[PDB]
Structures are given as C-alpha cells and as structure tokens.
C-alpha cells in the first residue's frame, strides 16, 4: 500500500479531513525527497503521494507550517546547508506548485524548531533555534555554548514574535506587554480563538513544563499556573486544539532524555490538566506531528521512538497513531 517512509522533523498540516505531510529526515542520515507531498485522508486512512513542482523548498527538518483555507504556508527549517528564513506557499485547492514569496519587511532570523499561531490574516511565529539575528531586533536571543565547539556557525534560542501579514506578505513585530516565555525551541503552539498557547520546549539545559498564552488581539503575554498535577517538562511534543476549550498534549522528550508516551488534555476553562488514557503507552514519540480531524480525533504521524540524538540507533517511525479525544 502507498505509505510514506519513516521520518522525524517533518511538517503535517490539515483542513480537518486531509493531512499534508512534507519533509523531515531519517537514517539508513538523509532528508526525505523535497518534491513529495504525502496526503493522508483522515476518514479512510489511505495515503496518496503527489509530486510537486514550482519553487520547491529544499528538503528540511524543523520547518514550521500552517494550512489556512487549503493554502499551505511553510517558514524556516534546516536543510543540508543550514537554517533558513524563506517563506513558501502551496495552494492545494485545485500539478501543485510551490511559490517562494518575496516578503516585504524584515524577516525573522534563520531558524527551525519553532511554532506558529494563525489569527485572521496573520501568521504569528514564535521562538526557535538558529543563527544570531543579523541585527538587534525585538526580543532576546541566547547562544547555545555547545554550538561553538562542533560547528562553523554558532546557534541559539530566541523568544521572538513575528507576524507575517497575508494581506500584503509583509513581516513585522508586535510590541508585546507582560513577561514573554524564555527563548526556546521545540516548544509546541496551539491556538484557540485569540489565545496563542505555548507549552514547554528546550532552553539551555532544560526541557520545560511551563504554559503561557499570548493574547493575539492585545499582544499581552500571560503565564498559566494550573493547580494540581502537571505534565513533566519536555520538548518535541505536540499540543493540538481539539475544541474551543481543550488542548491535547502527546509525547516528547524530557530533560533527562526519556522519550514520552503520556497524553493529556488541558482544559482552558478549568485551567487544569487531565491525563488521557490511550492504547499507545508502548509507542513514545518525539518530533512527530499531530493534526486534529473534524471527527474529534488527533492524528499523530512520524517522529522517533527513542533518543534520536544517538543517530545510529534512532527509531524513526512511519506509524499513524489515532487518539479518540472528543
Ligand atoms: C536538527 C538536528 C537534530 C537531530 C539535533 C541535534 C542536536 C541538538 N538539536 C537541538 C538543538 C536545539 C534544541 O533546542 N533542540 C531541542 C532539544 O534538545 O530538546 C535540539 C537538534 O535538533 C541539540 N543537541 C543536544 O541537545 O545535545 C545533547 C546535550 O548536549 C550537551 C546536540 C545535537
């Protein structure tokens, strides 16, 4: 049967019925073919591979993508020659053609492993890992000292918020109030209404357990302190909105390098986490993707079952894990 190869660090976006999968890498390391676009039909469980043309982005891991009215947008990532800040569009409504957009304004620094919130005409990007910004811009950047000893170009984490306005394809940075979360990468973002949630991620020697939201109307940051038991700190997890009041969390990697198979729901109205029982306790995943379907399910694809930092033993997956959340 038509089935995409195993991979981690790919993107997966959806319209609630079809899930589009692109990029990523695997071992036996190499990037998956840049021209392939895999489409999973969430209702039938079948895959279809299509070959794209146009301004095909380079093969990358850690890119950040969205699907808005069946138009896919892709930002950033890491290819064979490093990080990028290029922005692409792929209209999937109707051979599919990638379009690299010449954006106006100052783009974000080249980076990967970030997150995005969609709010009306705006794509709002947050955080990531990559090069030192070419100029001192709004926000903070912290170097990863380990990147000076094993590479020609040092990298670090940022807490930057950038808006790509789809009305004009212009980059800008909002002036925020409140305490932004620390710089981080491999955090997870989820949007509900005008609230852009962000949970966890890596910063310095920690994989974090903090939860915040940015008000996408006022640009005010808020820290959420749920009472009672909270999930363990992690990076490379997924956080997916499943209703107007619930975010679904799955997998990830702890500070002490444990791959995770726990799942939880964060109830926004109660400001509480509820652990979610599921049949995949023996299928931990990190750097997988998750997409919510119109039928209340969360579809998880790819990612790695163990510590992918030991490249020769990494267990990249091509499994679809289906969570019946709502
Ligand atoms: C994109 C290539 C990928 C396989 C990759 C490889 C390596 C690293 N990151 C990174 C870089 C930044 C970052 O925030 N995270 C997320 C996270 O750590 O949760 C992973 C990669 O993303 C970071 N490293 C690392 O953590 O080494 C262990 C500690 O060393 C004292 C060193 C090898």
């Amino acid at each position: 049967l038509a089935c995409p190869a195993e991979r981690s660090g790919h993107v997966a976006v959806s319209d609630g019925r079809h899930m589009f999968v692109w990029g990523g890498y695997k071992s036996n390391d190499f990037y998956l073919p840049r021209e392939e676009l895999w489409i999973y039909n969430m209702e039938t469980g079948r895959w279809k591979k299509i070959n794209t043309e146009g301004d095909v982005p380079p093969s990358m891991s850690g890119s950040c993508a969205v699907c808005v009215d069946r138009v896919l947008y892709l930002f950033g990532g890491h290819h064979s020659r490093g990080n990028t800040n290029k922005f692409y569009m792929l209209d999937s409504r109707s051979v599919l053609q990638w379009e690299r957009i010449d954006c106006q304004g100052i783009p974000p620094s080249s980076k990967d492993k970030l997150g995005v919130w969609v709010y009306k005409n705006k794509l709002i990007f947050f955080g990531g890992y990559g090069y030192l910004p070419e100029d001192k811009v709004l926000g903070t950047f912290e170097f990863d000292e380990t990147s000076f000893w094993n590479s020609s170009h040092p990298r670090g984490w940022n807490d930057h918020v950038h808006i790509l306005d789809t009305e004009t394809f212009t980059w800008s940075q909002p002036i925020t109030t409140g305490k932004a979360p620390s710089p981080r990468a491999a955090h997870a973002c989820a949007t509900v209404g005008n609230r852009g949630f962000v949970f966890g991620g890596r910063y310095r020697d920690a994989r974090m357990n903090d939860l915040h939201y940015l008000n996408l109307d006022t640009w005010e940051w808020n820290e959420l302190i749920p009472q009672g038991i909270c999930p363990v700190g992690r990076s490379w997890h997924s956080l997916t909105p499943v209703s107007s009041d619930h975010l679904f969390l799955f997998g990830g990697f702890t500070t002490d390098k444990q791959p995770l198979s726990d799942a939880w729901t964060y109830c926004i109205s109660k400001n509480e986490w509820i652990q979610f029982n599921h049949p995949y306790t023996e299928k931990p995943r990190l750097w997988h993707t998750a997409c919510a379907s119109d039928e209340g399910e969360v579809i998880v694809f790819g990612g790695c079952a163990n510590n992918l930092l030991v490249h020769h033993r990494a267990a990249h997956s091509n499994e679809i894990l289906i969570f019946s959340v709502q």
Side-chain angles (χ1 to χ4, degrees), residues 25 61 78 112-113 129 144 146 157 185-186 201-202 207 235-236 253 257 287 308-309 311:
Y25 79 102
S61 58
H78 183 270
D112 66 13
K113 295 189 295 291
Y129 188 73
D144 168 4
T146 70
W157 301 275
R202 160 96 192 271
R207 294 188 177 92
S235 69
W236 276 318
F253 195 49
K257 311 169 181 289
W287 221 359
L308 59 91
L309 305 174
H311 287 248

